[PDB]
Design a protein around this ligand. Structure first.
Ligand SMILES: [Cl-]
Ligand SMILES: [Cl-]
Ligand SMILES: [Cl-]
Ligand SMILES: [Cl-]
Ligand SMILES: [Cl-]
Ligand SMILES: [Cl-]
Ligand SMILES: [Cl-]
Ligand SMILES: [Cl-]
Ligand SMILES: [Cl-]
Ligand SMILES: [Cl-]
Ligand SMILES: [Cl-]
Ligand SMILES: [Cl-]
Ligand SMILES: [Cl-]
Ligand SMILES: [Cl-]
Ligand SMILES: [Cl-]
Ligand SMILES: [Cl-]
Ligand SMILES: [Cl-]
Ligand SMILES: [Cl-]
Ligand SMILES: [Cl-]
Ligand SMILES: [Cl-]
Ligand SMILES: [Cl-]
Ligand code: NA
Ligand code: NA
Ligand code: NA
Ligand code: NA
Ligand code: NA
Ligand SMILES: [Ru+3]
Ligand SMILES: [Ru+3]
Ligand SMILES: [Ru+3]
Length: 129
């Protein structure tokens, strides 16, 4: 599923991401925009052999099991394919663990390079939240 911008904002808010670990909703929408273009099915291989999965591009190196990332962790205790669902629940719950690990949203490279320090509220413009 490719979410709309306000559609994704509403789902992220329902799941408690607005201000989670101090990150306003626009930060999360911006991260999803540049990580996956809001496409729940997005997958991208990393040079180390891990893969990033779903709307928030969660990395099998640490967070989910894909069976093909030797030596990796599965700290969200989930198959990576569950992060590709049209239901964002699993991705949000895992993202909450990631953002709580000490480095905040810097875990998301596209957030650091394209969202951090910008007018992220623009990503929720017009949305009835
Ligand atoms: Cl579409
Ligand atoms: Cl659409
Ligand atoms: Cl479309
Ligand atoms: Cl959109
Ligand atoms: Cl719409
Ligand atoms: Cl629209
Ligand atoms: Cl659009
Ligand atoms: Cl459309
Ligand atoms: Cl939209
Ligand atoms: Cl958009
Ligand atoms: Cl757009
Ligand atoms: Cl929308
Ligand atoms: Cl929802
Ligand atoms: Cl909640
Ligand atoms: Cl909340
Ligand atoms: Cl915001
Ligand atoms: Cl892409
Ligand atoms: Cl990740
Ligand atoms: Cl497996
Ligand atoms: Cl593995
Ligand atoms: Cl932080
Ligand atoms: Na919220
Ligand atoms: Na906040
Ligand atoms: Na990522
Ligand atoms: Na893994
Ligand atoms: Na619009
Ligand atoms: Ru469409
Ligand atoms: Ru829309
Ligand atoms: Ru759009």
């Amino acid at each position: 599923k490719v979410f709309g911008r306000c559609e994704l904002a509403a789902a992220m808010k329902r799941h408690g991401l607005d201000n989670y670990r101090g990150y306003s909703l626009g930060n999360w929408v911006c991260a999803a925009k540049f990580e996956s273009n809001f496409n729940t099915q997005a997958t991208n291989r990393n040079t180390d052999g891990s893969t990033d999965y779903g709307i928030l591009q969660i990395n099998s190196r640490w967070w989910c099991n894909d069976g093909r990332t030797p030596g990796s962790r599965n700290l969200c205790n989930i198959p990576c394919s569950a992060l590709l669902s049209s239901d964002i629940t699993a991705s949000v719950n895992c993202a909450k663990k990631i953002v709580s690990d000490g480095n905040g949203m810097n875990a998301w490279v596209a957030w650091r390079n394209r969202c951090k320090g910008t007018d992220v509220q623009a990503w929720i413009r017009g949305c009835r939240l």
